[PDB]
């Protein structure tokens, strides 16, 4: 190309490249709130949780860890923080 | 844009209509790294949609280079496949260039005793992949090359690229139509920029014998 402004790449490129290979290694993970069915408690869950998260006092599993990404239990709504 | 580009050269709806009708926006399924700037979007089926705005804008620049020579006999146009052959002879007819259709004899530019010695000043080719012999000979005698490059078309020595479909008969004629009209306006044989031209489009479209 011989002429690229490497300081300010496209935001589409940022979502395309690897999380380390960008100009500044911004993590691709996030924190998210899980609404469990039958109760009204909000629990913060990591997007890539490695443990079976159970709500505080509801005794209900909220997500199962698999393949480097938590799979939320069916019947629960979520909202990224 | 403000400098050395008055607002008259901007695209018109008629030019956009003819280019779209010719399907000059439908590019090859393979994308080249050097044809990336001319890419607009890629459809769901994998067919690359080009940016017609750049195509017209590049055509104006190509005409500017042609008009700068100020000698029609020093401009050479080449097309191997018969689809571009009909347009090339007609382009030479109205402009004043020297045209070669079909097979390009090797040694035309380098060997000076062959029957087709040219000594041109500008090589204009269609589909610069089957005309690689013409391009490579231009690498020996310092001739800038203007090519109707496609998305997958090699750009080995293409100095000025015109991103357009170069496989359909309709697309080739329309692009060769754009350049023919622009060159004549620049040189001055046409008095008005807004006046329609008497020759029409199907005169350049390839026809069977």
């Amino acid at each position: 190309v011989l002429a690229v402004d490497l300081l300010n790449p496209s935001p589409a490129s940022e979502a395309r490249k690897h999380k380390l290979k960008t100009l500044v290694p911004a993590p691709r993970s996030f924190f998210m709130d899980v609404k469990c069915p039958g109760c009204f408690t909000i629990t913060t869950v990591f997007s890539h949780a490695q443990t079976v998260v159970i709500c505080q006092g509801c005794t209900t599993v909220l997500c199962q860890p698999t393949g480097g990404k938590a799979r939320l239990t069916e019947g629960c709504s979520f909202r990224r923080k | 844009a403000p400098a050395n580009l008055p607002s008259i050269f901007n695209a018109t709806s008629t030019d956009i209509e003819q280019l779209l009708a010719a399907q000059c926006h439908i590019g090859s399924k393979n994308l080249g790294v050097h044809m990336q700037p001319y890419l607009w979007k890629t459809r769901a089926d994998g067919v690359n949609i080009l940016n017609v705005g750049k195509t017209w804008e590049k055509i104006v620049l190509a005409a500017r280079i042609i008009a700068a020579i100020d000698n029609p006999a020093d401009i050479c146009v080449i097309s191997a496949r018969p689809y571009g052959q009909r347009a090339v002879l007609k382009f030479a007819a109205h402009t004043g260039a020297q045209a070669i259709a079909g097979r390009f004899t090797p040694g035309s530019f380098t060997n000076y005793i062959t029957r087709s010695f040219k000594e041109p000043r500008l090589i204009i080719v269609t589909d610069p992949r089957t005309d690689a012999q013409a391009i490579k000979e231009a690498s020996y005698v310092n001739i800038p090359v203007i090519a109707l490059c496609d998305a997958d078309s090699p750009t080995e020595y293409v100095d000025v690229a015109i991103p357009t479909n170069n496989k359909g008969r309709h697309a080739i004629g329309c692009v060769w139509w754009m350049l023919a009209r622009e060159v004549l306006r620049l040189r001055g044989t046409i008095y008005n920029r807004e006046t329609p031209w008497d020759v029409m489009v199907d005169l350049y479209f390839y026809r069977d014998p």
Binding site: - | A11, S13, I16, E17, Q18, L20, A21, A22, H25, W40, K41, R43, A44, D45, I49, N51, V52, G53, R86, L89, K90, H170, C174, M200, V201, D202, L203, F205, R207, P209
Partner: protein, 124 residues
């Protein structure tokens, strides 16, 4: 085998490329033609040239041959080239049937006035 040499073929083509109206399909008349126009001084060679000339003349009556103009073709290909239909195939006379990405280019380029008929794009 009886394969004619290049000195016969090349000379005969020049005869056809120049003297087509004078020539005809009769060998005996073509025999006399080669007498007046060429300088052969060899009956065998002249008979071969007239014989090969007659072969192509009969070929001309079918549409062949490439590369032996025959200026009557040259004037003919002129009128073929000049021919052009009056109605342009690029005319919209449903006017312009393109897809979602093509019309998006029109909005980007500032030409959102063409009678564009947007068609769906799906993969089978």
């Amino acid at each position: 085998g009886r394969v004619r040499t290049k000195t016969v073929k090349k000379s005969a083509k020049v005869i056809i490329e120049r003297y087509y109206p004078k020539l005809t399909l009769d060998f005996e008349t073509n025999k006399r033609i080669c007498d007046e126009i060429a300088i052969i001084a060899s009956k065998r060679l002249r008979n071969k040239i007239a014989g090969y000339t007659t072969h192509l003349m009969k070929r001309i009556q079918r549409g062949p041959v490439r590369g032996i103009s025959f200026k009557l073709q040259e004037e003919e290909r002129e009128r073929k080239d000049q021919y052009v239909p009056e109605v342009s195939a690029l005319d919209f006379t449903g006017q312009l049937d393109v897809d979602t990405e093509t019309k998006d280019l029109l909005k980007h380029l500032g030409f959102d006035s063409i009678p564009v008929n947007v068609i769906p794009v799906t993969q089978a």
